[PDB]
Design a binder for these strands. Structure first.
Ligand code: MG
Ligand code: MG
Ligand code: MG
Ligand code: MG
Ligand code: MG
Ligand code: MG
Ligand code: MG
Ligand code: MG
Ligand code: MG
Ligand code: MG
Ligand code: MG
Ligand code: MG
Ligand code: MG
Ligand code: MG
Ligand code: MG
Lengths: 152, 114, 99, 100, 83, 127
RNA sequence: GGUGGGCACUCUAAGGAGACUGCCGGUGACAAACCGGAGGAAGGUGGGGAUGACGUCAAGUCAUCAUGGCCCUUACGGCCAGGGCUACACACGUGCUACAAUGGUCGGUACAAAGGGUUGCCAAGCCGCGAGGUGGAGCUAAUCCCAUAAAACCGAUCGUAGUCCGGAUCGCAGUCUGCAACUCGACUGCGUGAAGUCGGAAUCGCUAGUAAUCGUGAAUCAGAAUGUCACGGUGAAUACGUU
């Protein structure tokens, strides 16, 4: 806004993992106020993650999150005849939000049985750089570095 | 087996494919002759498909149902009542809107001229 | 033993009536179980203000009814009836029970 | 709000109040659990013999000041745009503008 | 449909006319306005001219149109077609 | 003995009593698990107990009424914090930094005339 | 809480206290003010509502009412019965229900606010799969009735199919109100089961208890709400900035 008066809220209460980031992830997967359904979905996905193998499910979670947050972002700007696209570094807070939004949106459209299974598959595949989200990140990165001329 | 009935499905839902039995009718059928509704038809010995036949032959099925429905519709059509006239022209007969919104009895929009 | 129910459309005069009944009862030597404010009834209306088509232009009104309860213990003098012209004066509906 | 409209609604109210009880027992006879079919038929024909414009369902209450069929409030007797006039002057006891 | 507490609904004057019209058999139509009246089983084979809003249409009553009402055989709107 | 707190949250209220005990917990005369079934309501109702690390020492008797399950849990937390404050009134800071003593004033915004919801509007076609 | 009883508590409803840049640091023309901090339930007009300046659009209303002038007075006045305002090759505006697996069915269970009822609400018992019918208790109501909140949680099943999705349409049989449900009512049972696989150019709402979603009540009212006006439950994402 113009006034620059927005103040950020503090509601962050991970119940049984005590991990600050998973509460925000569950807020992202929540639809229409149904906290419990999203709660169950995320916990089921993490159970699948912990039973596929020996990796700590939470640790796999932040490893995927690190391997999916973009470093630079492209911003459009019309210069009087053409709309160019400058690169700019992404703020530390925006990285995780973009990562979660992309991860959830791409897990939405996979096509397995239940949403928890979709999320688990996305976390397993993106934990090494093979998911749709990771290639979207690569597309954004190459698009940003192909416009390095403006940058500043 | 059935009369071209679907298989690999629960008995009640499978029965509902008969054109004359719905959900509640199928429940009554399965309740009258002791059979588990949660049982697939492919797992039933014929010793009970036979009594399913006997029970289902009690009501109506396919050809005769259509026969009597068309009898009733033709009666309405030939009498000349308001219901019959409205039913001849393919227009809603319970008294719904026809200024707009009556495309379930007219299909596509059919624009003026071409 | 007698119980009094008091009803009014505003709080000032119902408070005045409760105060005067209570003080008369205290003077006449009787005992009073404290006044009880029953929950008020609020009925609301939403009325169009234009003579013709302006739907979003409405105006809202309300009527509140205030209710109080008194009751007395150990009565020997009955002049609360004797104030029939004064315990209720202008706009107070008074109901007497166990007369 | 023609004067004829008010006159004929007054006529309807008078004539509906005129009988106001024969209809009651006639309905009781028709809807009685055990009353025999013949009593049912006699009650039906007697009740249909009564004038048509004598039933409470034909009464459309109007503003007692202007006779406006619409915007009627039964708590008061007034229509939509006489109630506001009365309430602004403070005539109506208890009515105030509220926000909550 | 009307409840089964009172089987039919028939107007007094129309019922009286129908019951008169059986002493001498069907010869002339009965002119009426009561579209609300249901046809009785024992007035079959007689012709009734029911109001339409502009004139009276004649209807010859047969056994198959018993449970209906007179107004069901008099359309009050024309609609000869947009094209 | 004992201590009494009054908590309030989202049209819900809670009366809480703290006595010496062994963490029995009873809400409306039934167990905590039977009341809040598998959610973070247990976490929110217990938070001040472990933050003050007195979960095991207090016996709690609660009567809650009004609102929904989350609002009731917030009421229990508020009442527990107030009673804990009045018991050993030196740790007001400890709860204050956690924001438990503060009472949340958010309420359901009323419907407005001409609008669908408190803030939503019809679609506004301009032609 | 059923009783004796209690005036502790919640609650109800009258009167008060409280929040004032009040105190501290820094900037500032040692001004107005601004950025932070402590205390506090609340901090910077705390949240919301009512409140609409001079005038604008010869804006809307002569059909709510009132009214200048004009017009009809065997009709442009009044009474009645049927019909119409519900038409239907089409086009547009505002909504509702869905296209499903964060879901559909069956069973087990928990928690609201607000409001209406004596030309009224209408219980318990009994009779019907059901809408409902008989019955008459209680209440001129913080007392009795409307009146079971739903989503949420637990268990079982369905396993991606135009389907245990979706419910339109039509056939048969009923209930209720009403003098009277044909034109043209609302509901109930049985059967049928359409379009619909997330929607072109384009376009709208929303900044916190908000959007999203779930249910409840009232006015009008014999009967007739997916509309209107109110009430709670669960409960987000985002704002670097003014190119
Ligand atoms: Mg006049
Ligand atoms: Mg009416
Ligand atoms: Mg509110
Ligand atoms: Mg548009
Ligand atoms: Mg502070
Ligand atoms: Mg501060
Ligand atoms: Mg002001
Ligand atoms: Mg204004
Ligand atoms: Mg003009
Ligand atoms: Mg005009
Ligand atoms: Mg007429
Ligand atoms: Mg119209
Ligand atoms: Mg279904
Ligand atoms: Mg704003
Ligand atoms: Mg709401």
């Amino acid at each position: 806004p113009r006034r620059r008066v927005a103040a950020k809220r503090e509601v962050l209460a991970d119940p049984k993992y005590g991990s600050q980031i998973l509460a925000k992830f569950m807020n992202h997967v929540m639809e229409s106020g149904k906290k419990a359904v999203a709660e169950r979905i995320v916990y089921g996905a993490l159970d699948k993650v912990k039973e596929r193998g020996k990796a700590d499910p939470l640790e796999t979670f932040e490893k995927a999150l690190d391997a999916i947050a973009p470093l630079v972002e492209v911003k459009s700007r019309r210069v009087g005849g053409a709309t160019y696209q400058v690169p700019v570094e992404v703020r530390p807070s925006r990285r995780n939000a973009l990562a979660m939004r992309w991860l959830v949106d791409f897990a939405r459209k996979r096509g397995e049985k239940s949403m928890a299974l979709r999320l688990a598959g996305e976390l397993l595949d993106a934990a090494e750089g093979k998911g749709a989200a990771v290639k979207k990140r690569e597309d954004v990165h190459r698009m940003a570095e192909a416009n390095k001329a403006f940058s500043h | 087996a059935g009369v071209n009935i679907p298989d690999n499905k629960h008995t009640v839902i499978s029965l509902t494919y008969i054109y004359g039995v719905g959900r509640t009718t199928a429940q009554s059928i399965c309740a009258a002759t002791g059979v588990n509704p949660a049982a697939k038809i492919k797992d039933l010995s014929d010793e009970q498909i036979d009594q399913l036949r006997n029970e289902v032959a009690k009501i109506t099925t396919e050809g005769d149902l259509r026969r009597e429905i068309n009898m009733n519709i033709k009666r309405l059509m030939d009498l000349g009542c308001y219901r019959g006239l409205r039913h001849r022209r393919g227009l809603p007969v319970r008294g719904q809107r026809t200024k707009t919104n009556a495309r379930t009895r007219k299909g596509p929009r059919k624009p003026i001229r071409k | 033993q007698i119980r009094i129910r008091l009803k009014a459309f505003d709080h000032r005069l119902i408070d005045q009536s409760t105060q005067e009944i209570v003080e008369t009862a205290k003077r006449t030597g009787a005992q009073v179980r404290g006044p009880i404010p029953l929950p008020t009834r609020k009925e609301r209306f939403t009325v169009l203000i234009s003579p013709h088509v302006n739907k979003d232009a409405r105006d809202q009104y309300e009527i509140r009814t205030h209710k109080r309860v008194l009751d007395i213990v150990q009565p020997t003098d009955k002049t609360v009836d004797a104030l029939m012209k004064l315990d209720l004066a202008a706009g107070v509906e008074v109901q007497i029970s166990l007369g | 709000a023609k004067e004829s409209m008010k006159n004929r609604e007054l006529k309807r109210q008078l004539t509906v109040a005129k009988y106001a009880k024969k209809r009651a027992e006639l309905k009781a006879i028709i809807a009685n659990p055990n009353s025999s079919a013949e009593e049912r038929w006699n009650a039906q024909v007697a009740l249909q013999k009564q004038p048509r414009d004598a039933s409470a369902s034909r009464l459309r209450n109007r503003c007692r000041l202007t006779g406006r069929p619409h915007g009627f409030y039964r708590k008061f007797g007034l229509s939509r745009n006489k109630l506001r006039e009365a309430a602004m002057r403070g005539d109506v006891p208890g009515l105030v503008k509220a926000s909550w | 449909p009307r409840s089964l507490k009172k089987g039919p609904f028939i107007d007094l004057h129309l019922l009286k006319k129908v019951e008169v019209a059986v002493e001498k058999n069907d010869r002339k139509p009965i002119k009426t306005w009561s579209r609300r009246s249901m046809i009785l089983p024992h007035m079959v084979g007689l012709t009734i001219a029911v109001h339409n809003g502009r004139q009276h249409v004649p209807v010859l009553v047969n056994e198959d149109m018993v449970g209906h009402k007179l107004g069901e055989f008099a359309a009050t709107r024309t609609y000869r077609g947009h094209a | 003995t004992q201590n009494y707190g009054t908590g309030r949250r989202k049209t819900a209220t809670a009366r809480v009593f703290l006595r010496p005990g062994t963490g029995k917990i009873s809400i409306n005369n039934r167990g905590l698990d039977q009341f809040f079934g598998r959610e973070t309501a247990r976490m929110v109702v217990r938070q001040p107990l472990e933050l003050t690390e007195t979960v095991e020492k207090f016996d709690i008797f609660v009567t809650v009424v009004g609102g929904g399950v989350s609002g009731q849990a917030g009421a229990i937390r508020h009442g527990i914090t107030r009673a804990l404050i009045e018991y050993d009134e030196t740790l007001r800071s400890s709860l204050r930094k956690a924001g438990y003593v503060t009472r949340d004033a958010r309420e359901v915004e009323r419907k407005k005339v001409g609008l669908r919801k408190a803030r939503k509007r019809p679609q506004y076609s301009k032609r």
